[PDB]
Amino acid sequence: GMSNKFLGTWKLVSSENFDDYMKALGVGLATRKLGNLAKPTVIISKKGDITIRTESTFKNTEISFKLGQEFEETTADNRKTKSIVTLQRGSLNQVQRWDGKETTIKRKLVNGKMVAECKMKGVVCTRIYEKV
């Protein structure tokens, strides 16, 4: 199952190419400006379902799911998606589908950091988090 090394509170330390990723999702300019200034905390826990909670001054989000079971998600930019989280070679892989579009957020552990790779339409964003 998901490694217990994911569990905990993680703080964003680096983000590369977020603005073009948000653009590819359809996010408007003023929201992107705030999204690029945000430094969220991500809290991963498990109590039956796995929960991934994101906290920031601009927006908070939360998803709770079982691996491999499609669920309804509301994203930080207020998309209403059908999403599935899978585990592949230790990476926690989230696909979101809405309005015939798809994006993936792969989260993996690298030397104790958590690396999120976000992909939309060939645009790739990398966000690196350190455990608190």
Ligand X SMILES: CCCCCCCCCCCCCCCC(=O)O
Residue set of the binding site for (9Z)-octadecenoate: 107, 127-129
CA angle 18, 23, 28 (to 5 degrees): 110
Tell me how far apart the terminal alpha carbons of the chain are, to the nearest angstrom. 23
Confirm if 44 and 85 have CB atoms less than 8 A apart: no
According to CB under 6 A, which one of 6, 24, 35, 50 is a site residue for ligand X? 35
According to CB under 5 A, which one of 6, 18, 42, 103 is a site residue for Mg ion? 18
How many secondary structure helices (H) and strands (E) does the chain include? 2, 10
> Which amino acid appears at position 131 of this protein?
K
- The residues that bridge with 122 in the sheet, in sequence order, are none
Shortest separation between residue 19's beta carbon and Cl ion, angstroms: 16
Which of the ranges 53-61, 68-76, 99-107, 118-126 carries the binding residues for Cl ion, by CB under 5 A? 53-61
Query: d(Cα 88, Cα 65) in Å, to the nearest integer?
Result: 16
DSSP-based three-state secondary structure for 76: coil
Judged by CB under 6 A, the chain residues 64 through 83 that form the site for ligand X are: 75-77
Residues forming contacts to Mg ion in the complex (CB under 5 A) are 15, 18-19
Residues forming contacts to ligand X in the complex (CB under 6 A) are 22, 25, 27, 31, 35, 38, 40, 42, 54, 56, 58-59, 75-77, 105, 116, 118, 127
Residues forming contacts to Cl ion in the complex (CB under 5 A) are 38-39, 56-57
